[PDB]
Structure formats: C-alpha cells, structure tokens
C-alpha cells in the first residue's frame, strides 16, 4: 500500500514510484511503471519527459575534484510524459490507476519495458588508495521538463533517482558438480589420482562449502601441503574482452600424504567479506547510495547464448592445490554458483 516518491529541489515537480527493485524470471521482467505529479501552470509552455538510462559509471557524484566516470551510455530510452500520449503500452497499470484516483487530474502515468539483454546492477569495491567511489554499472531514472529533448538540463527542473535490478535463484536443482584428475610420472606407470566433489551445485551466502576431496597417491612422491581456495571471476566487457580474477577465501591444512596411500577428507571453506575490506577490485552487489552489502551475487545467463557482453559478468569457481615434493604440483578446478534465494 505504501508508495515511494521523489520531488524536485524546487518542490514543484514530484515523481512517484511504487517499487524500488525489479526482478527477471529468465523470460520476462517486471515493467517500470509510475506517475509524475506536476501542475502545468508552472511550465505553461514546456513539455515533460521521463528517461531510462543505464551507464558504466565510475567514481562518486558529490562534486569530487577528479576526472569523473567514463560515461558510456549502454542503453537509453525516452518517453513523452507531457503532453499526454496515447493509451499504449498497452493499458494503464493498476497501481497507476490507484494513484490517479488518489491525486486526480495532474497525475500522468508512464510505461517502460526493460530489454532482456541487459546486465545486472553490480559495483566494484573502492580502494583505500583511490578517492571517492569506484566503477560500476548502475540504473537511473531521470525526469525533466523542457521545450525540446536537447534543451540544456537544469538542476531545479530535472530529478534523478536510482533503481536496482536483481535476479533470484531458480527452484530447479542442476547436475551434481564433481571433478577428477589422474597424473602419472614421466617414465614409471605409477600415477596420482585425485577426485573432488561438492554437496550441491547451488548454495547460499554464509553457508559453509563442504568440499569432498579424495586423494589416491599410489605414487613415489610425497605431497607436502594441501591448499583449497575459491576464486571469483569478473568479466569486464565494454569494447574489449577482460576478466579480473581475485581470490576471496583460502584455507590450508598441514597434512602429509604418504606415497602408495589413499587419503580422503571433507574440508570447510566459507566466503565472507569481513577479511577483504581492503582488497581492491572486489565485486559487490549494487548499493543504493553507499550502504554495505554481501559479495556480488552470481548472475546466471539466460537460456539463449547470444552475446550479452554489455557490462559485468560474474562467476565463482573452487580450486584445490596439492603441494607435491620436487615439483609436479597438480591442481583441480570446479565451477559453482552462489547467489540469493527467492524471498516471499
């Protein structure tokens, strides 16, 4: 029943939004619908428009003394709020009708559709060495009044508000993730067998990862140490292909694997943000203004492979490293997903 609203600094132009967050069901997205409230006597000759834009923004917005974002406009949409447009698309919405009931004549609804080929709201962790905020893709709604679309923007006229787009976990479990690797010697037939498995393929933040690793060291070398870690992969694509990978959680056990022996164990690794408050380049979930959040939720690609290289893509993997004596170190990897469940 409650309804958010934002107003112009002059107090004359006000916009109402019923929701702050939107979700996608891998086939459709919740439409962005709202109503702008304004008395036409203030303008009496201008026209009101509301614009949807998504940009690759860097830095902060509080008049920092530094070169600001490389403002790449990934996608921009415009709608004519005033003068009134025809009925589509397609009808007015229920909440817009209720708000028009609440206000009356000066209520003007608008409709928008979000294309399916858009990235998710993510924000990179700013570094203490740097200043202000950091780079990150964000959504933004902008409403303004002017006689022309190309008229100069005014602080008193234009109003800026920030919205978010997030995904939620599907209810269908996937195949069981497992991996194996057998490495022999240079000449002798003796080999080194290792197998890694996980309880599930989809987990939840704060839930420990019970990795099941089995080592069949039917060889002559002795494994000195064992290292288990999870790696975060962040694909950066604006006009070139890039990927910045940073370790997030590492666990080491002082276990010796004797030659011609089989050793299997289950280890616990937990990703958390407390220990990485200073690590630059970390990817985090989209924030409102500056509020803290958890780690960046693993966004899942749609069924269509297409391109979808229009922003930041994130994925997680787990690697286990065996410290074999006199070289011969062998490591195995396993991809997995980790992102929020569906609320009610």
């Amino acid at each position: 029943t409650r309804v958010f609203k934002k107003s112009s600094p002059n107090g004359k132009l006000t916009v109402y939004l019923g929701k702050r967050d939107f979700v996608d069901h891998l086939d459709k997205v919740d439409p962005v619908d709202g109503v702008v409230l304004v008395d036409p006597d203030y303008l009496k000759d201008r026209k009101v428009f509301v614009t949807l834009t998504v940009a690759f923004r860097y830095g902060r917005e509080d008049c920092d003394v530094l070169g600001l974002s490389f403002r790449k406009d990934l996608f921009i949409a415009n709608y004519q709020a005033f003068p009134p447009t025809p009925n589509p698309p397609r009808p007015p919405t229920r909440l817009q009708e209720r708000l028009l009931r609440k206000l009356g004549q000066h209520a003007h609804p608008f409709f928008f559709t979000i294309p399916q080929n858009l990235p998710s709201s993510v924000t990179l962790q700013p570094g203490p060495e740097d200043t202000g905020k950091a780079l990150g893709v964000d959504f933004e709604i902008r409403a303004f009044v002017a006689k022309s679309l190309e008229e100069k923007s005014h602080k008193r006229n234009s109003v800026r508000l920030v919205i978010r787009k997030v995904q939620f976990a599907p209810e269908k479990p996937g195949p069981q993730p497992s991996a194996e690797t057998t490495r022999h010697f240079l000449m002798s037939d003796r080999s080194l067998h290792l197998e890694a498995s996980l309880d599930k393929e989809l987990y939840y933040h704060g839930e420990p990862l019970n990795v099941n690793v089995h080592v069949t060291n039917n060889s002559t070398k002795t494994v000195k140490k064992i290292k288990v870690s999870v790696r975060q992969y962040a694909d950066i694509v604006l006009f070139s292909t890039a990927q910045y990978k940073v370790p997030v959680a590492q666990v080491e056990q002082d276990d010796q694997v004797s030659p011609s022996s089989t050793f299997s164990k289950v280890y616990t690794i937990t990703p958390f943000l407390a220990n990485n408050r200073e690590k630059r380049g970390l990817a985090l979930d989209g924030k409102l203004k500056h509020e803290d959040t958890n780690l960046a939720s693993s966004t899942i690609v749609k069924e269509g492979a297409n391109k979808e290289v229009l922003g930041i893509l994130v994925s997680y993997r787990v690697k286990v490293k065996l410290v074999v004596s006199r070289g011969g170190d062998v490591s195995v990897e396993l991809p997995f997903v980790l992102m929020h469940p569906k609320p009610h």
């Epitope: 704060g206 420990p208 407390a274 958890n294």
Partner: antibody
Framework: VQLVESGGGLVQPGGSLRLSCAAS????????IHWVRQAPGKGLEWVAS????????YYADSVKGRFTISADTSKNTAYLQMNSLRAEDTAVYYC?????????????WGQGTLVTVSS | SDIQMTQSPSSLSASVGDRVTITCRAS??????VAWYQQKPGKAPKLLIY???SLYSGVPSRFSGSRSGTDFTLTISSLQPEDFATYYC?????????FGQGTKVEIKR
C-alpha cells in the same frame, strides 16, 4: 535446531564473569547473535549485538567499554564478557539469533539464564 | 537518537473471544520495521507479527495488525484460554532497538 547456554551464578559487585551460548542447527555466519537481559519486574533490555559476517560490534550506552563480546567460528559459540559489575545489572539474560539476509526479528530464543549480583 | 516507546493500554482484562486492541506509539516515524512479541510468565519470548503485517508460521490466523502513520495496532480475533500473557512492541530500523513496556492480559470475573 536448539539453543543452549551456561555460565550463570552469583558474583560480588565490581568483579567480572564470562557467559557462553552455543548454537546448533544453523550457521553463525548466515545469522547474527543478540544478547538481551530481563530484570525482575522490568521488560527485556537489549545489551549488545555481533555480526560475524560483517565483522561489526555494538553495545548499549550503559555498558560502553564495560561489556565485551566474542565468538569462535569453529565451535559456533558466542561469548560475552562484562566487567565492573554493579547492583543494577542483575537480570535474566538471553541469547537469540536473527536471520542475516535479512533482518526479520528474533525467531529463535534460548531458555535463558539468570544473573544475580550482590554481597 | 533514542526513539520513545508508548504502548497503550498498559494492561486490561476481557473475556473469551472478545474485541481486544493494543496500540503502539513511537516518537519517530518508522516505515514497517515493527515486530510483535509475546512472552508467557516464566518462559521464553516468542514473536507473533514481523514487519508489522506478516504473520509468522505456526501461528493462529486470529492475530492481525495494521499501521497508520506512527500508530501501530494489534488485533486478536478470539481470545484463546491460553493467550493470557504479556506483549511487547519492538522497532528495529534504528540503532539501538527500543522495546515496549509490556501488555499483560488477564481474564475477568
């Protein structure tokens, strides 16, 4: 899912004590631990809070510096230590858990232990 | 700063299946971060309504509430012969949390 705790007793005012509250059936990381005291004839009063995932600590205004909190992740147990006991700190103390993502109240509560301070 | 709590009424008595309403007041506006708790005498507290509108699982539907600005009201459909206890009003959108003054319920004769 169960909640257990121990460490109650009678301590002379001005001393110190250590209380424990083990957690089972869930995770310390995916939740937060809250401590609340209930004086005889008075309502429950929150004292401190811990957020292991965010690594933040909070205390009440009346127990700033006097009361400390701690938790070991391996054993899934939380420990709070209070110092410089006064006669007005006697109450029944409870340890409770709250869902981290996101906050929706205090769904589960421990049975609670009484704290008595006097000479 | 601290947010004042003003529960009303403090404690009254009624009969089985009666109209009972409990009102909560706050010195500062809070959107929806209001929770309702009930604690039987000598036992552990237990919540009934969280977010001021959501009914917790394993709870009879007779309990309900509503919000009007800073006014928070608890409504009970019919009084069970085991609901005679105290109730507390809680807000959790500001640090620190502030608790209610307790609303004991008793049977009249």
């Amino acid at each position: 899912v169960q909640l257990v705790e121990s460490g109650g007793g009678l301590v002379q005012p001005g001393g110190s004590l250590r209380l424990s509250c083990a957690a089972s059936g869930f995770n310390v990381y995916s939740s937060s631990i809250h401590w609340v005291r209930q004086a005889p004839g008075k309502g429950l009063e929150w004292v401190a809070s811990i957020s292991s995932y965010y690594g933040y600590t909070y205390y009440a205004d009346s127990v700033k510096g006097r009361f400390t909190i701690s938790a070991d992740t391996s054993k899934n147990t939380a420990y709070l230590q209070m110092n410089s006991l006064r006669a007005e700190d006697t109450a029944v103390y409870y340890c409770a858990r709250s869902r981290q993502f996101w906050y929706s109240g205090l769904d589960y509560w421990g049975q609670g232990t009484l704290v008595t301070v006097s000479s | 700063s601290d947010i004042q709590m003003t529960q009303s009424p403090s404690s009254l008595s009624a009969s089985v299946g009666d109209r009972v309403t409990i009102t909560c007041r706050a010195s500062q506006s809070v959107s929806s971060a209001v929770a309702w708790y009930q604690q039987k005498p000598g036992k552990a507290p237990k919540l009934l309504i969280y977010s001021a509108s959501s009914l917790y699982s394993g709870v009879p539907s007779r309990f309900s509430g509503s919000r009007s600005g800073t006014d928070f009201t608890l409504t009970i459909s019919s009084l069970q012969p085991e609901d005679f206890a105290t109730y507390y009003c809680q807000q959790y959108k500001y640090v620190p949390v502030t608790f209610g003054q307790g609303t004991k319920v008793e049977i009249k004769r």
